[PDB]
Amino acid sequence: KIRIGINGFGRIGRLVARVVLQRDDVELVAVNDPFITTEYMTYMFKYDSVHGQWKHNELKIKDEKTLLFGEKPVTVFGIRNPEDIPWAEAGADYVVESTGVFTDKDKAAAHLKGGAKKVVISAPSKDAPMFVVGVNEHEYKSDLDIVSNASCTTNCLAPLAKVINDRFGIVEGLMTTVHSITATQKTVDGPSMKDWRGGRAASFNIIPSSTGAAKAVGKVLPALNGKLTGMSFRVPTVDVSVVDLTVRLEKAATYDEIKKAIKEESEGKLKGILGYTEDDVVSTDFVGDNRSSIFDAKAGIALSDKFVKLVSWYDNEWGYSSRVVDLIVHMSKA
Amino acid sequence: KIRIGINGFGRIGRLVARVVLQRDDVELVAVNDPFITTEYMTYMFKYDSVHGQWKHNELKIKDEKTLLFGEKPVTVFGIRNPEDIPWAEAGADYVVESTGVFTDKDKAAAHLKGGAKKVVISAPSKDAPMFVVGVNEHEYKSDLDIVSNASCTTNCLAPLAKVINDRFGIVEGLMTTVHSITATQKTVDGPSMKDWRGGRAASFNIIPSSTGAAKAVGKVLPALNGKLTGMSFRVPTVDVSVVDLTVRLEKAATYDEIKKAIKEESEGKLKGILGYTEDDVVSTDFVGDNRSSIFDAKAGIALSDKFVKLVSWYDNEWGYSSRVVDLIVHMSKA
Amino acid sequence: KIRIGINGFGRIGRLVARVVLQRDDVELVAVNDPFITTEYMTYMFKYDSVHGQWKHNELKIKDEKTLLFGEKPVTVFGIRNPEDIPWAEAGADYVVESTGVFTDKDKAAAHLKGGAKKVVISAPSKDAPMFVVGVNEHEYKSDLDIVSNASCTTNCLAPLAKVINDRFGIVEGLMTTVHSITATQKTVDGPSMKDWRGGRAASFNIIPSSTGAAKAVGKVLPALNGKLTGMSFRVPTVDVSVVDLTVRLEKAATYDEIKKAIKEESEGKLKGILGYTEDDVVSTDFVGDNRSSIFDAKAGIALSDKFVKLVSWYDNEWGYSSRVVDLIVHMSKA
Amino acid sequence: KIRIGINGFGRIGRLVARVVLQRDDVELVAVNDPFITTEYMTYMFKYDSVHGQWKHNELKIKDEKTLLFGEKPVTVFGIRNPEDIPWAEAGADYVVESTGVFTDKDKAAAHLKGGAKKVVISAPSKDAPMFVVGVNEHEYKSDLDIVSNASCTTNCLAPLAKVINDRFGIVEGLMTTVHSITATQKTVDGPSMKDWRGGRAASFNIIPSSTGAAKAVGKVLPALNGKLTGMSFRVPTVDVSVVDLTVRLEKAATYDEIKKAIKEESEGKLKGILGYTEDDVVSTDFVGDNRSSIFDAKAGIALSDKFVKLVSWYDNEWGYSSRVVDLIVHMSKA
Ligand SMILES: NC(=O)c1ccc[n+]([C@@H]2O[C@H](COP(=O)([O-])OP(=O)(O)OC[C@H]3O[C@@H](n4cnc5c(N)ncnc54)[C@H](O)[C@@H]3O)[C@@H](O)[C@H]2O)c1
Numbered sequence A, B, C, D: 001k002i003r004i005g006i007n008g009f010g011r012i013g014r015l016v017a018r019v020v021l022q023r024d025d026v027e028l029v030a031v032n033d034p035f036i037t038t039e040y041m042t043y044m045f046k047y048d049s050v051h052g053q054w055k056h057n058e059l060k061i062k063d064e065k066t067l068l069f070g071e072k073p074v075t076v077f078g079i080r081n082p083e084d085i086p087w088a089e090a091g092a093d094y095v096v097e098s099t100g101v102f103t104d105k106d107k108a109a110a111h112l113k114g115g116a117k118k119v120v121i122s123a124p125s126k127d128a129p130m131f132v133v134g135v136n137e138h139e140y141k142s143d144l145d146i147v148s149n150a151s152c153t154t155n156c157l158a159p160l161a162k163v164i165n166d167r168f169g170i171v172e173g174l175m176t177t178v179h180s181i182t183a184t185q186k187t188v189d190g191p192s193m194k195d196w197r198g199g200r201a202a203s204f205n206i207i208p209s210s211t212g213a214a215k216a217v218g219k220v221l222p223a224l225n226g227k228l229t230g231m232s233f234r235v236p237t238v239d240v241s242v243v244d245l246t247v248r249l250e251k252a253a254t255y256d257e258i259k260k261a262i263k264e265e266s267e268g269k270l271k272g273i274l275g276y277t278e279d280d281v282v283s284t285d286f287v288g289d290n291r292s293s294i295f296d297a298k299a300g301i302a303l304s305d306k307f308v309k310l311v312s313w314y315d316n317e318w319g320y321s322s323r324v325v326d327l328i329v330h331m332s333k334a
């Protein structure tokens, strides 16, 4: 009951694996990563520069095919092709497309040929529909072959967008995300035909980067379709990011009004997805924080009562993996 | 003709000194820093982690009182009290208040007792009037005892604000500044009663910080008095910062229109103060860039034709020192 | 009945507090830091950039003076002078001198005037005797008023010195310590007449620094008095450091022989002080690892069977606080 | 008549290009990098995070194929296979193998099929002979098709080895190199079966790494063949590295004796290859310092007069490119 395999033992792959292993609702059946060998998988999973050493179970048994997590066998695949993954063989019904390349619906439906039942993109997708848990997750329908969990930025912005829009009405917004570095960036000035600035040495540079979570909100909250856009700056932190959201409002609201509205929703419908703090926090204070988005009351500032800048933290690695699992489970029920 | 002494051989002190020494319009007579010894001043000036080794002149002669820069004697003071600095003794007519503590007009006018003629704050000041070269520098009057050159953020924002306001009209704006770390921050989690988040380890943290350059623009551009405010994030770069400015407009304007208007002003009145680039730049590309503010055309993004987010780079250390000197010279003439 | 007060709520202060509060054999009675107020102590102790948010119970009760660690009393002092702390007129019998300035025996014995019974320096001391737990801790005598727990680096080197000297005999050694940055360093090139290179921007520099733990080992292990010395390089990590020790040996020994001897001692007499790993570890893999020293078998290399370079990790922050408490406890058992 | 093409526009490619273009005894004919397009080469060469914007003349002319360094021809190739470069059917007589993959003599001699006359490896090579300029460069012979300039670390260690061995005799040595990060490392914990610790987040870790330059010194200095070995620690600096060398000596020598010998050789035969400083330097103080090796007198420390630890800085990027060109030139003089 609820059987999971991961295609791509990346950062998100491994962290989703951590989360799954700790949960009782789910099992972890198999994993596919051609670029890592089984024995190397044991190392990569145990030791972690951001989220600490793993402090439960684990070992490794079968030559090249399986590991033992305490007493739980997990089957290992290193198969470049995405169909020749024998899903369902290892009874993996849900797949986590965590590779970052197969993020088209077209492209993601290669695992079903392998025998898998449902595939979840750990990333946004042009074609595959998008679901931010806490906002539109209920709009899931039980026949949806393929699906996307959007992006960290989307999963941080969309709940805050929802609360603010509902309570006071969003006219226009522009969003910046001061964001940590990621696997796609480069340690030293290097080639990046895709984004010329993305190749520059990530850890000693502020890097203008292109997001798109703000328009992707429209896709997960059609009310706001076309009323938001924004940009990113990658800066030299290893993890944790934050959203700076600048919005014009339909209905007037003082700063305390919007703060208290967010405290309300953080206690009500959005307990566990949208948090709320009034403390002198910083990025490290959110490493291993399973919330999608946390409102920072002391950080933000308002200009009018129709114009306001709002700040929300989010652990791009941990929050997003948590939400991925949450989404899998909502699917398993619905 | 134009004789300069520096009270506070900080980062800005030393860099203003670099700039002055390279200029022919100005002489560098004396310096006061109780926390550095003469011989240590030679080291601190030569070697520099951001702006490279010094590649002209320099040496050191008189026990504790003076140095020789090629063949130019500079008198050394290490006097905690700010009046017991014998300005005018060493014929220092202009003073650079670069300490960061005496930034009140009241407090800055201690050097005149020493015998100095005029004092320039390398920082904003509540009481002492403010001048951003390129915007309001002409509003200087020849009887102004004390004066302030505002802040790096102000010197980056105000020219961009001016161009945009003049061409299209600013209704409302909120500004964020992704900013490098500074002497006030701390290497490791430490005490900072003034700003609790400012004490947290600066180099491995994103740190919400409080600016005020956006309201200080009103003081240097009264047209916009009260129509802007914003915030800062200190991130782990050693130098160079950037402004993200989100504005509502009176008069419609496409992105190319505002880009070309800024290219215009960068060629016209604001050659040398406001630059303009359409290249895939990053923070390091602006170390040792004497401009106050550089428009980044590829980075910015617009939502409507009345709502737009604009990005401008600035070397908080070098640009500001350049402007400080520029201001001294405009004063010397006017 | 073990009652402890901390003079100096620094990094070592706060972390020693973590360690004490979590263990049950010891209690934390009072704390003194003039530069931090009670509520600021609550913040600084709760949130931590290296060792995470604190995962037990604590807050603050009375309009200053006292704090509450789950309905229990911690008295707060902000008294700049080091006596006049009512250590006895409150209940603090053991004191942790964690300020970093009072490290003379003479000056450390100011807390006794306050009424405290015994004082432990969280640092080496010229005059006050030194104890590395796991090596010489037993030579303590029950009448010794004041005492020092040496240095983070000493506590990493000394157990390895003991094992190697005992099993094979050390002829000569020179040790390097690639060490993380600390509170004494500077975020940007700044004044530090004490160590001229220490003022240079800590986070963007390799910085030659001078230790003295290696000759100080003789002071806690007279067998090798004068047989070692070395140096440090400070590098831009937040915490965790490592010792590289280059030794000539009396009795020949292959690398695996030395590995097996260290594994033995790590399992035997030196369980918990000296660890042992044959894994592809890195600095972060030791954040919050209370061992004094961890031998890295794969990293080291031998030239002959008398000439060998040995590598040992240590969390300069966590290991040392653990040892400080451990030592207090060994003392209590008269 | 010295015509050079670069296979691999990496860090070493681009920087060698800087060096060649600035000097007049050599010309730059063509360049090959399949993963970069012409205009992207213009960007990548112009802007640089370590060595600043380029301060001469350059841009691009023809719809790819060729570039212009001030009305002069540079032919552009993007040819993945290493022959089929019309090195001769263009004009490139010397080739810089800067890709990092073709470092076998066998595989490096693919450019000769393209028509090139001589090939220099920007890296050590199993089979292809090795030359450290300033030590063994003269043993080159005019018929040697293919060749290697060793490693950044080799070129720092070997001259110091020469001076110390010659003046006092090296019995045994073990060397550590606290080394900056490089393109091979990873921004976040990532896959690298080659060096398991090398995949760990490069910018937030001390990373044990294995060099081999120290035994490779024997290969370019047979006097000491088998008399040295060592290791590396990669730390989060962008560039500049340092060698820590621990040696036992045949003939006694006080520290100042060794200082004076190295100062001598730095003034005499080894001007420009081996420098000498008695100043409180740090890594950044050597960014863009074309010397192979700089002795740091204040940093080092001696135990006896036969046992001593010696420290030498080197810009792994700039020094090595300088040496590569220098070597090409020494070759041209048959
Ligand atoms: N890292 C984050 O903070 C983050 C947050 C949210 C979403 N995401 C999304 O997750 C995806 C990957 O991100 P990441 O940070 O894990 O990158 P990553 O490099 O750490 O992970 C990619 C992993 O996939 C593996 N892989 C490559 N090709 C494969 C194949 N064909 N079959 C199976 N495995 C393969 C690689 O070994 C690699 O480890 C991207 O789409 C990204 O947008 C990342």
Ligand SMILES: NC(=O)c1ccc[n+]([C@@H]2O[C@H](COP(=O)([O-])OP(=O)(O)OC[C@H]3O[C@@H](n4cnc5c(N)ncnc54)[C@H](O)[C@@H]3O)[C@@H](O)[C@H]2O)c1
Residues within 6 Å of the ligand: B007, B008, B009, B010, B011, B012, B013, B032, B033, B034, B035, B036, B079, B080, B081, B098, B099, B100, B101, B103, B122, B123, B124, B151, B152, B182, B183, B184, B316, B317, B320, C190, C191
């Ligand atoms: N550093 C920047 O990027 C930057 C940019 C713009 C403006 N500023 C302003 O410059 C001021 C200082 O900034 P900084 O970065 O140079 O800080 P800093 O710490 O580097 O400089 C302060 C210097 O003043 C010296 N000093 C302290 N007390 C003194 C005294 N009483 N008399 C003479 N000298 C004394 C200290 O030795 C120190 O070196 C602040 O007001 C800051 O707002 C800084």
Ligand SMILES: NC(=O)c1ccc[n+]([C@@H]2O[C@H](COP(=O)([O-])OP(=O)(O)OC[C@H]3O[C@@H](n4cnc5c(N)ncnc54)[C@H](O)[C@@H]3O)[C@@H](O)[C@H]2O)c1
Residues within 6 Å of the ligand: B190, B191, C007, C008, C009, C010, C011, C012, C013, C032, C033, C034, C035, C036, C079, C080, C081, C082, C098, C099, C100, C101, C103, C122, C123, C151, C152, C153, C182, C183, C316, C317, C320
């Ligand atoms: N940081 C490390 O990795 C580490 C490791 C081993 C040893 N040590 C030693 O610990 C000592 C402090 O190190 P740290 O990292 O905690 O430095 P720190 O600056 O973080 O701690 C010093 C604390 O003492 C407080 N203090 C200053 N003056 C005081 C006074 N007169 N009375 C009471 N409190 C006062 C300050 O508020 C400060 O918080 C140093 O001697 C250092 O050598 C530190």
Ligand SMILES: NC(=O)c1ccc[n+]([C@@H]2O[C@H](COP(=O)([O-])OP(=O)(O)OC[C@H]3O[C@@H](n4cnc5c(N)ncnc54)[C@H](O)[C@@H]3O)[C@@H](O)[C@H]2O)c1
Residues within 6 Å of the ligand: A190, A191, D007, D008, D009, D010, D011, D012, D013, D032, D033, D034, D035, D036, D079, D080, D081, D082, D098, D099, D100, D101, D103, D122, D123, D151, D152, D153, D182, D183, D316, D317, D320
């Ligand atoms: N980086 C240093 O500090 C340094 C110092 C000494 C030696 N080296 C050596 O230099 C070599 C490369 O180092 P780097 O830092 O320049 O790495 P790099 O990745 O920056 O450079 C390699 C370049 O070669 C290009 N390339 C890859 N395949 C190619 C192909 N088949 N044909 C033509 N070009 C191709 C790539 O585009 C890349 O830009 C390595 O062997 C390294 O050991 C580097």
